[PDB]
Amino acid sequence: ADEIGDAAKKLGDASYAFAKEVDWNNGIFLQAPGKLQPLEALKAIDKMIVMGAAADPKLLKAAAEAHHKAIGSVSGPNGVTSRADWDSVNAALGRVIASVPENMVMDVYDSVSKITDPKVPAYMKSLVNGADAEKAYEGFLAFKDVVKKSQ
Amino acid sequence: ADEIGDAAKKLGDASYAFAKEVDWNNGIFLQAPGKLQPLEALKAIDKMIVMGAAADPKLLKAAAEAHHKAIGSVSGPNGVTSRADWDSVNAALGRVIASVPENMVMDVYDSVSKITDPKVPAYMKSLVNGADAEKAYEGFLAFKDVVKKSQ
Ligand code: CHL
Ligand code: CHL
Ligand SMILES: CCCCCCCCCCCCCCCCCC(=O)OC[C@H](CO[C@@H]1O[C@H](CO[C@H]2O[C@H](CO)[C@H](O)[C@H](O)[C@H]2O)[C@H](O)[C@H](O)[C@H]1O)OC(=O)CCCCCCCCCCCCCCCCC
Ligand SMILES: CCCCCCCCCCCCCCCCCC(=O)OC[C@H](CO[C@@H]1O[C@H](CO[C@H]2O[C@H](CO)[C@H](O)[C@H](O)[C@H]2O)[C@H](O)[C@H](O)[C@H]1O)OC(=O)CCCCCCCCCCCCCCCCC
Ligand SMILES: CC(=O)O[C@H]1CC(C)(C)C(=C=C/C(C)=C/C=C/C=C/C=C(C)/C=C2C=C(/C=C/[C@@]34O[C@]3(C)C[C@@H](O)CC4(C)C)C(=O)O/2)[C@](C)(O)C1
Ligand SMILES: CC(=O)O[C@H]1CC(C)(C)C(=C=C/C(C)=C/C=C/C=C/C=C(C)/C=C2C=C(/C=C/[C@@]34O[C@]3(C)C[C@@H](O)CC4(C)C)C(=O)O/2)[C@](C)(O)C1
Ligand SMILES: CC(=O)O[C@H]1CC(C)(C)C(=C=C/C(C)=C/C=C/C=C/C=C(C)/C=C2C=C(/C=C/[C@@]34O[C@]3(C)C[C@@H](O)CC4(C)C)C(=O)O/2)[C@](C)(O)C1
Ligand SMILES: CC(=O)O[C@H]1CC(C)(C)C(=C=C/C(C)=C/C=C/C=C/C=C(C)/C=C2C=C(/C=C/[C@@]34O[C@]3(C)C[C@@H](O)CC4(C)C)C(=O)O/2)[C@](C)(O)C1
Ligand SMILES: CC(=O)O[C@H]1CC(C)(C)C(=C=C/C(C)=C/C=C/C=C/C=C(C)/C=C2C=C(/C=C/[C@@]34O[C@]3(C)C[C@@H](O)CC4(C)C)C(=O)O/2)[C@](C)(O)C1
Ligand SMILES: CC(=O)O[C@H]1CC(C)(C)C(=C=C/C(C)=C/C=C/C=C/C=C(C)/C=C2C=C(/C=C/[C@@]34O[C@]3(C)C[C@@H](O)CC4(C)C)C(=O)O/2)[C@](C)(O)C1
Ligand SMILES: CC(=O)O[C@H]1CC(C)(C)C(=C=C/C(C)=C/C=C/C=C/C=C(C)/C=C2C=C(/C=C/[C@@]34O[C@]3(C)C[C@@H](O)CC4(C)C)C(=O)O/2)[C@](C)(O)C1
Numbered sequence: 001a002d003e004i005g006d007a008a009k010k011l012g013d014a015s016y017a018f019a020k021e022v023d024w025n026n027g028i029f030l031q032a033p034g035k036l037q038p039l040e041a042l043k044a045i046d047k048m049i050v051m052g053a054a055a056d057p058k059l060l061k062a063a064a065e066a067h068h069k070a071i072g073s074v075s076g077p078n079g080v081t082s083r084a085d086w087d088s089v090n091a092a093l094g095r096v097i098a099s100v101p102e103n104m105v106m107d108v109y110d111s112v113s114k115i116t117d118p119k120v121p122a123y124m125k126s127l128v129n130g131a132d133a134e135k136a137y138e139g140f141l142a143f144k145d146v147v148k149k150s151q
Numbered sequence: 152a153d154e155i156g157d158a159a160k161k162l163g164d165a166s167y168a169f170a171k172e173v174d175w176n177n178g179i180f181l182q183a184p185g186k187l188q189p190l191e192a193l194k195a196i197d198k199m200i201v202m203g204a205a206a207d208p209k210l211l212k213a214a215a216e217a218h219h220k221a222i223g224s225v226s227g228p229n230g231v232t233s234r235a236d237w238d239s240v241n242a243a244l245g246r247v248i249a250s251v252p253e254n255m256v257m258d259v260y261d262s263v264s265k266i267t268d269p270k271v272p273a274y275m276k277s278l279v280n281g282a283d284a285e286k287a288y289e290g291f292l293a294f295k296d297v298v299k300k301s302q
């Protein structure tokens with residue numbers, strides 16, 4: 001057990017209602033988030049590859065395992081995993097983020113933002129309960145503060 | 152140095168002319184290869200996650216590093232990496248494939264095939280030199296025999 005695991009449980013309280021409202025079977029997620037821009041996207045994918053090579057290999061292993069278990073507990077019409085697996089996944093991802101330098105994480109966020117159309121967040125939010133999405137995000141902000149403290 | 156590295160060099164002789172003919176900047180690769188079928192695709196993605204968790208963590212690390220280096224040497228109008236980086240990537244991927252049980256690799260191939268429209272290989276091949284694609288594939292068959300012997 002660790003502090004990221006404790007923080008993932010609080011994050012789940014704040015975010016699982018949002019998770020249940022996303023339609024994870026929507027084909028939209030395979031689309032570019034705006035105009036397809038292969039050269040810019042490749043730069044973002046490169047920042048991710050750099051980060052994956054920097055990440056602790058045992059923690060990437062554990063984060064993959066957690067996703068395989070989450071897939072096994074999917075149910076209902078939106079394809080949402082169990083509450084327990086939602087928290088497990090978030091904690092395992094938090095540990096991966098904490099295993100690399102902060103600049104590597106920001107480089108991914110910046111490089112993806114560059115290819116992401118300004119309308120995309122609002123359109124995503126419009127398909128769920130707005131208050132639940134806001135509560136999820138304030139949850140994320142509290143969680144990332146625990147993650148940073150392990151980083 | 153190892154036998155997979157030697158085999159990757161022969162594979163490059165057989166396949167790099169094909170690599171140069173693919174338009175890696177074509178947006179088509181972001182499309183589902185046929186009808187989008189999220190439940191079946193998730194099963195294929197699950198076989199991959201299982202395989203990634205089973206793979207040797209040092210070899211997955213090295214395979215990511217090899218891709219970051221390959222991205223740095225991209226040139227020309229099709230976005231093709233250098234011959235040296237093409238071989239490096241193939242050897243590092245060969246080592247990853249050899250680090251997991253054969254059944255895990257076949258499970259991915261079967262689960263992806265299930266969502267892949269029968270027209271897709273021929274359409275892909277139609278955008279390149281057919282003889283070069285055939286020479287690439289016969290190269291692959293020789294390479295996978297070396298990979299299997301390390302497996
Ligand atoms: C079928 C498998 C599968 C699916 C469908 C997804 C889906 C996703 N992954 Mg995951 N992953 C999957 C397998 C795996 N992933 C990962 C490792 C990662 C990493 C390292 C990351 C992702 C992230 C993401 C998200 C990227 C898009 C995004 O940011 O949306 C928005 C995100 C959500 C809807 C997820 C919940 C986030 C938050 C706790 C609550 C919601 C807050 C806000 C309302 C919206 C988000 C705001 C931003 C600024 C944080 C997306 C939800 C990324 C992500 O979520 O970025 C924030 C991310 O950083 N995945 C591994 C390797 C261990 C997997 C397999 O093993
Ligand atoms: C920008 C980054 C990036 C891009 C564009 C790609 C693109 C691709 N990856 Mg790669 N990857 C990338 C980063 C990374 N990959 C991987 C790990 C993997 C793995 C483990 C595998 C792929 C494979 C593939 C291919 C999947 C589709 C396919 O099978 O087409 C057809 C494939 C090609 C055109 C590639 C050349 C194959 C062969 C040597 C020559 C051509 C033979 C035939 C003519 C066509 C293929 C026949 C099939 C039956 C083998 C595709 C070419 C898969 C693959 O190639 O399956 C065969 C695969 O197994 N990637 C990692 C983690 C280390 C990456 C980042 O770090
Ligand atoms: C070949 C196939 C390969 C596939 C490759 C696929 C990967 C790339 C696919 C792209 C997917 C991107 C779409 C993501 C949208 C989700 C982000 C979002 O809604 O974000 C919403 C935010 C909203 O903006 C924020 O809005 C906030 C509002 O807060 C206010 O309001 C809050 C609650 O309402 C609180 O009150 C809070 O305290 C208060 O300040 C603040 O103003 C912040 O400053 C501001 O950042 O937008 C922002 O961040 C702007 C930046 C958004 C850019 C995207 C960021 C995602 C980075 C994640 C990296 C993952 C990469 C994707 C793939 C990885 C999978 C492994
Ligand atoms: C949210 C975003 C997340 C993104 C997720 C994305 C991943 C999934 C995206 C799907 C991409 C799939 C499209 C791939 C097409 C390439 C395969 C192909 O052209 O294949 C061509 C072959 C042609 O068929 C073969 O044709 C051969 C012909 O050989 C003959 O001819 C030869 C030379 O002409 C030689 O002479 C040879 O000796 C002689 O026998 C033989 O008959 C073989 O038995 C027969 O298999 O088709 C076959 O195999 C049929 C099976 C094809 C199924 C696809 C196989 C790919 C499996 C790779 C796993 C990678 C998964 C993809 C993503 C992974 C990235 C990490
Ligand atoms: C081989 C293999 O398994 O690889 C594995 C690799 C990983 C990394 C482990 C993995 C993973 C995680 C991944 C890829 C996550 C990807 C997330 C993608 C999110 C995409 C989104 C939000 C896309 C869009 C597109 C939208 C378009 C919106 C608009 O166009 C619309 C409607 C109309 C316009 O008028 C206005 C508009 C509003 C602009 C939008 O609103 O959102 C996975 C899945 O496991 C597969
Ligand atoms: C060896 C091997 O196999 O590697 C493989 C391993 C993987 C994992 C499968 C793999 C992969 C994918 C990877 C690395 C994905 C990485 C994702 C990174 C996500 C980062 C995020 C969300 C960062 C942020 C930063 C944010 C900042 C927000 C704020 O600053 C803002 C704006 C304003 C301030 O006022 C307050 C603030 C709130 C602070 C934010 O909100 O989010 C890959 C590439 O395939 C390689
Ligand atoms: C088709 C289908 O059914 O798919 C199903 C597939 C599944 C897997 C079963 C499934 C599921 C679950 C899923 C997808 C869960 C996704 C979770 C994503 C979690 C992401 C996390 C936590 C990302 C971050 C990024 C962080 C960055 C933090 C920092 O940068 C920040 C901000 C500010 C810096 O100053 C400091 C910092 C510390 C660097 C962080 O702290 O955390 C579901 C729902 O069932 C759908
Ligand atoms: C070949 C093939 O078929 O592969 C298949 C493989 C799969 C895995 C099966 C597959 C899949 C599934 C995938 C990747 C699913 C990804 C889901 C990502 C979902 C993202 C969502 C919800 C994003 C948001 C962002 C939002 C932002 C809200 C806010 O910012 C807003 C507006 C205002 C801020 O002030 C406050 C805020 C509240 C922060 C929100 O509310 O939500 C797919 C697509 O089927 C393809
Ligand atoms: C966060 C992050 O970085 O994730 C990283 C995760 C990884 C795994 C490391 C990674 C990687 C590798 C990946 C995903 C490789 C994906 C390969 C996809 C190949 C897709 C293909 C061939 C798609 C199609 C679609 C086609 C459609 C054809 C047709 O419809 C057409 C024309 C008209 C119809 O009449 C007939 C038809 C003929 C049916 C086709 O012919 O082909 C990457 C890139 O690094 C990103
Ligand atoms: C911890 C962590 O981070 O994990 C992350 C790590 C990654 C790597 C980034 C990641 C990923 C992606 C993964 C695993 C991709 C795996 C790809 C597997 C490819 C397998 C292939 C091509 C298999 C085959 C089998 C074939 C057989 C052909 C033949 O039998 C046939 C028909 C007919 C016979 O007569 C002759 C024959 C010729 C023998 C073939 O032709 O091809 C993931 C999911 O994101 C997790
Ligand atoms: C937009 C843009 O510009 O992107 C650029 C991005 C880059 C990265 C810079 C770039 C590049 C290079 C790329 C993509 C290279 C891709 C290489 C893929 C290699 C895949 C390999 C070897 C897969 C396998 C699968 C195998 C399976 C083998 C077996 O199953 C078989 C058969 C039969 C079983 O009985 C035994 C077995 C042993 C189990 C194997 O042996 O090998 C490029 C071109 O520049 C494009």
Ligand SMILES: CC(=O)O[C@H]1CC(C)(C)C(=C=C/C(C)=C/C=C/C=C/C=C(C)/C=C2C=C(/C=C/[C@@]34O[C@]3(C)C[C@@H](O)CC4(C)C)C(=O)O/2)[C@](C)(O)C1
Pocket residue numbers: 031032033036037038039041042045173175176177178179180181271272273274275276277279284285288
């Ligand atoms: C959000 C966002 O924008 O992300 C962006 C991220 C990126 C990385 C920048 C990006 C990208 C690039 C990607 C994934 C590229 C993937 C390329 C895969 C190419 C596959 C090809 C060529 C497949 C084939 C299959 C063929 C088969 C030929 C044969 O079988 C045939 C007929 C007959 C057999 O008898 C013999 C045979 C000879 C075997 C062939 O000849 O070729 C993209 C798309 O821009 C999206």
Ligand SMILES: [Cl-]
Pocket residue numbers: 001002
């Ligand atoms: Cl505890």
Ligand SMILES: [Cl-]
Pocket residue numbers: 036037038039040
């Ligand atoms: Cl571009």
Ligand SMILES: [Cl-]
Pocket residue numbers: 152153
């Ligand atoms: Cl040698």
Ligand SMILES: [Cl-]
Pocket residue numbers: 187188189190191
């Ligand atoms: Cl389906």
Ligand SMILES: [K+]
Pocket residue numbers: 130131134
């Ligand atoms: K509101």
Ligand SMILES: [K+]
Pocket residue numbers: 281282285
């Ligand atoms: K021919």
Ligand code: NA
Pocket residue numbers: 056057058059
């Ligand atoms: Na470690």
Ligand code: NA
Pocket residue numbers: 207208209210
């Ligand atoms: Na090892």
